[PDB]
Design a protein around this nucleic acid. Structure first.
Ligand SMILES: C[C@@H]1CCO[C@H]2Cn3cc(C(=O)NCc4ccc(F)cc4F)c(=O)c(O)c3C(=O)N12
Ligand SMILES: C[C@@H]1CCO[C@H]2Cn3cc(C(=O)NCc4ccc(F)cc4F)c(=O)c(O)c3C(=O)N12
Ligand SMILES: [Mg+2]
Ligand SMILES: [Mg+2]
Ligand SMILES: [Zn+2]
Ligand SMILES: [Zn+2]
Lengths: 66, 47, 261, 242, 261, 47, 66, 242
DNA sequence: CGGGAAAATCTCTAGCA
DNA sequence: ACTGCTAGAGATTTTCCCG
DNA sequence: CGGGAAAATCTCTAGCA
DNA sequence: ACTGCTAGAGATTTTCCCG
């Protein structure tokens, strides 16, 4: 039930930037999605990112590749 | 308060001091002689 | 340093020396010389050295007009994926822009357009079209192409591909559509090693899926969390940390000093 | 990994497709694909349809994605091959168009359209289109009073049909349906690419006979031998290219 | 991949796909796709992403002309220190440039001038003046201001200071000389926290002193060093390493496997 | 040998292939149809 | 005699750049000066630098400051 | 550090200047300066001279650095205050000009020249110049045949005098001499700045009476007490600002 | 556990006009 | 109250692959 | 040996047109 | 065979200073 859905959320990957940093950070794992913020987990570190600064995708190549 | 000196629009001469109204990431809203302007933070100095 | 400061302000009225020169030549501390410079309006001639970041939300499109071979090309880019939409139009007129934007709204979920302050983009016809389609117009700071650097760089890319394939077509409209095709489906790279078409399909499908799944999770997972406060809403828990939303302020706290009810 | 036998039993019982086993039993899509392809008893995103409609003395070129009902339509100045080729080249530049069904008209059999399809890599082939045309005409008549020119009302109708009218099983619009279908096609293409990339290897384990490779994991290697899937540690097997 | 390569070259003639797209769509290895791209002349549209470094020798001056208030300003910068020399001149004429350069040669040890290919700088009068003064002319690659970016940045600095002090003068020549003074003696920073005047005096005095001391050391210290070779000349020894000059090729070798005679 | 593609002088269109004669730090000397040109390495690709 | 002169050489400081590096490196100590090359010692490391890439100065501030 | 007594003995014997002790005994310039200033029995780069010379009906404005013989000359259109002020402002922008000696002429006492000197921070004061003018005239006559216009021959003569003619003790040209003199002045100014910066401190050592600070080293502190210089470890003394 | 090769990542530029 | 970016070319670092 | 403050260093941009 | 740079504004890291 709920655990399945949470796993499907965590299956998505987020690319994001910081306020003063112009290079896009690697594919962090999605934990929560909101109207203006997303909660991720990048290298055992949980951050809250503005929705305007994050690109959320399920990279199909990787999915199909285990 | 703050003083803002800015380059506004296709005019190389810097203008100011102006009053700072809002400071965002990348842009500032200022007031200069009862005129409200939005300037990128590249083109502004805030003191 | 009372004598030194006076001899530094008197010199600055003549030479507008930088803080280092007056600090060295009047034995001033760096803070005092920097204060002397900062109080001179004639020396406030440089902005701070950074750049902003454009909005990259899944619904924003950046539109612009570019010129090639004497013709006008209207170009739109979906910011989050790099997918473009271009079309040769007879003139930079609000009617042509309105028709183009109505097309784009009819083809893709366009929530917001970000353009410069050209006449065609600020026309009342375009404002009426965006209102009918429910599109929010964001206008750039005037004469700041960096505000829509995405569509500017896309203009560069489109013109390069048009130069590459101009011989294969007879008219500019055909070559523009050929370049659009090439950019959308024949050039890979970016976040997912995708083409722009694949990336836009991934982005939009992901948004739909994540919205639905999050709606279901929030409908099922309903708890209140007390930390340190009020009944904060529970967003995510696990791995020794809890993510909560208290008074529309999302914060992350460790599992300790928190209880879920 | 450990759920391969469970997946085999599930396929033998319910004839589930590889998507289901991959989503449920936590298997890589290649292993589930091999499981679903190992049983003989268990054995669209690119097709568009083009038609021309006349309304108030003007010609409207309509393209319908067959698998979803999503439409792309516009008013063209004349029923000519050049305009058809321009429309088709635009459509191929916006969507992955593989093949277009047409009605053997004059503008579709033109040499310009054939050349455009050749450049775009589209195959030309000569009931849904009629119903979609009627629906488009109904919406155009509904929203004509909101537009001075017919092309603007046509685009407004296209927008309404693609994103405002909803229907079907889950109540999605045509835009969401086409996005889902194209995403599924992209996943299918990625899986086919991975299968093609890995099918050129041969694996020797424990040395036993050559075995087809399925998944080169971080902690194990999944192989197939004698129509049976076996998991072996990486250090106990060698992989070569043939 | 014989079939795949043919289907990738045939596609590339149509779309000019980047290497990633063809590698993905034809199962090609990255090297094969990169080779396919590299053999297409239509796709060779980008230079390598770096910058050169200008000559910074103590004797090189970079000269340029700039325009302010309808007048022409001839500017020279000593590259190694940032010290400038500017003067308003009636027109960009080889006579004015020749007179200016003769002045500069008469005031400072000018060994080489590096300018762009403007008409005044390539004039026969300027070539005759440089020959009389023993000045080597280096001309930039045409239409590459980066070759003399030092004097270009100095033009920017000079114009900024002129804007700062324009009110204090009545004519442009007076304000230009005032800005020259301000830049040379009233703005500190750089390698030594110096002004440009102090830095140029340090640079030239250092060159004279080091030349004399090195001459004396080479006259006194005369030895031949054998390492691994021929009788290499000894330049510096100590701290476990020896610096030698063999056949006009300076190399550094450790004290081991070397003997001084 | 090498192939050189270059942007030469105020002309946005890239030209080549040319023969590489000398490769320094920052610039290359090339030969293109019996014409010797000196191009900054920013504006050249050497294969 | 010779040692005094060598000490005076080593009293000078050199600013230099590398072929692909655009930021000027710190004040290395001068060891030898030639027509086209200078030998320095930057952080217990001896390099040979083209004369066109090096700025040699005796920073008077520092001298007068021990 | 250990050579302070040696430096004191050397000064008492030979009356050497602080440059000598600093170069020889390896002492910071402040300590050697205090040593040389501690004995009572042991007790130019900015001065330019301006004159106007007439040659072939044209006026030449000549500036001579007094301490070195280095010249700056040019032909001016007229003997007027504006041209003199322009010349002086240029010279001050090229060299550290502190004071200029003049001959109470009309162009030197003008208000424009006074204003220019005020802006430039130059002091105006009203035999070397005559000899230098004669030498410049001789070189101009020598090289006149190599230049069509008199200003070009004037600049050629300036170049020859500054960098080609050599003379004196060590056989240096005027350019090398002025460079050496200005470098020595810069060293003097840096030392004066450091002395002014450090003279506002007072040091208590081992606690004894206040002592004037001389050098704040990395491993020791050099102080002066009762007209005597003593070296104390940093951890054994405290430095305060007064 | 050790080198090589391949791949991935990082650094950096022109053009957008 | 808004905001530089992109893609390609070289250089450097990680990872994989067989020992 | 420990924080704070000051200083030094590093990062980054516009204009040179 | 020749070649981007400079100086100022903010942010971050080192160093010095008294305990
Ligand atoms: C008449 C409207 C209204 C007001 O402004 C003008 C002029 N303008 C100028 C550029 C331009 O200068 N691009 C070069 C560039 C420079 C820096 C950067 F970061 C990105 C860049 F693309 C445009 O693209 C553009 O659309 C306009 C335009 O439309 N207008
Ligand atoms: C008629 C001569 C002969 C041939 O070329 C032209 C045109 N030109 C153009 C610039 C210029 O574009 N500066 C802007 C800039 C851009 C980039 C950069 F890195 C540094 C920069 F200063 C000059 O400075 C200059 O002297 C000339 C010139 O003299 N001429
Ligand atoms: Mg634009
Ligand atoms: Mg220039
Ligand atoms: Zn000022
Ligand atoms: Zn190509």
């Amino acid at each position: 039930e709920l655990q399945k859905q949470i796993t499907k959320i965590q299956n998505f990957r987020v690319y994001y930037r910081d306020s003063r940093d112009p290079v896009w950070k690697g594919p962090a794992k999605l934990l929560w999605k909101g109207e203006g913020a997303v909660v991720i987990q990048d290298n055992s570190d949980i951050k809250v990112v503005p929705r305007r600064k994050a690109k959320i995708i399920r990279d199909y190549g990787k999915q199909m590749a285990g | 308060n703050f003083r803002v000196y800015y380059r506004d629009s296709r005019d190389p001469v810097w203008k100011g001091p102006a009053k700072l109204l809002w400071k965002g990431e990348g842009a500032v809203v200022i007031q200069d002689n009862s005129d409200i302007k939005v300037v990128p933070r590249r083109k502004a100095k805030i003191i | 340093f009372l004598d030194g400061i006076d001899k530094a302000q008197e010199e600055h009225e003549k030479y507008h020396s930088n803080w280092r020169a007056m600090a060295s030549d009047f034995n001033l501390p760096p803070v005092v010389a920097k204060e002397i410079v900062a109080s001179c309006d004639k020396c406030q001639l440089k902005g701070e050295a950074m750049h902003g970041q454009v909005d990259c939300s899944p619904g924003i499109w950046q539109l612009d007009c570019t010129h090639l071979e004497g013709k006008v090309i209207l170009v739109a880019v979906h910011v989050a994926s790099g997918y473009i939409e271009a079309e040769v139009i007879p003139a930079e007129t609000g009617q042509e822009t309105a028709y183009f934007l109505l097309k784009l709204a009819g083809r893709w979920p366009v929530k917001t357009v970000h353009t410069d302050n050209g006449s065609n983009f600020t026309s009342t016809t375009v404002k009426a079209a965006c209102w009918w389609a429910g599109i929010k117009q964001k206008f750039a700071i005037p004469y700041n192409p960096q505000s829509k650097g995405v569509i500017e760089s896309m203009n560069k890319e489109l013109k390069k591909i048009i130069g590459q394939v101009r011989d294969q077509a007879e008219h500019l409209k055909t070559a523009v559509q050929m370049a659009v095709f090439i950019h959308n489906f024949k050039r890979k790279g970016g976040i997912g090693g995708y083409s722009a078409g694949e990336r836009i399909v991934d982005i939009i499908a992901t948004d739909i899926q994540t919205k639905e799944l999050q709606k279901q999770i929030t409908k099922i997972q309903n708890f209140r969390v007390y930390y340190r406060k009020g009944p904060a809403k529970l967003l995510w828990k696990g791995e020794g940390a809890v993510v909560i939303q208290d008074n529309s302020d999302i914060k992350v706290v460790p599992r300790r000093k928190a209880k879920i009810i």
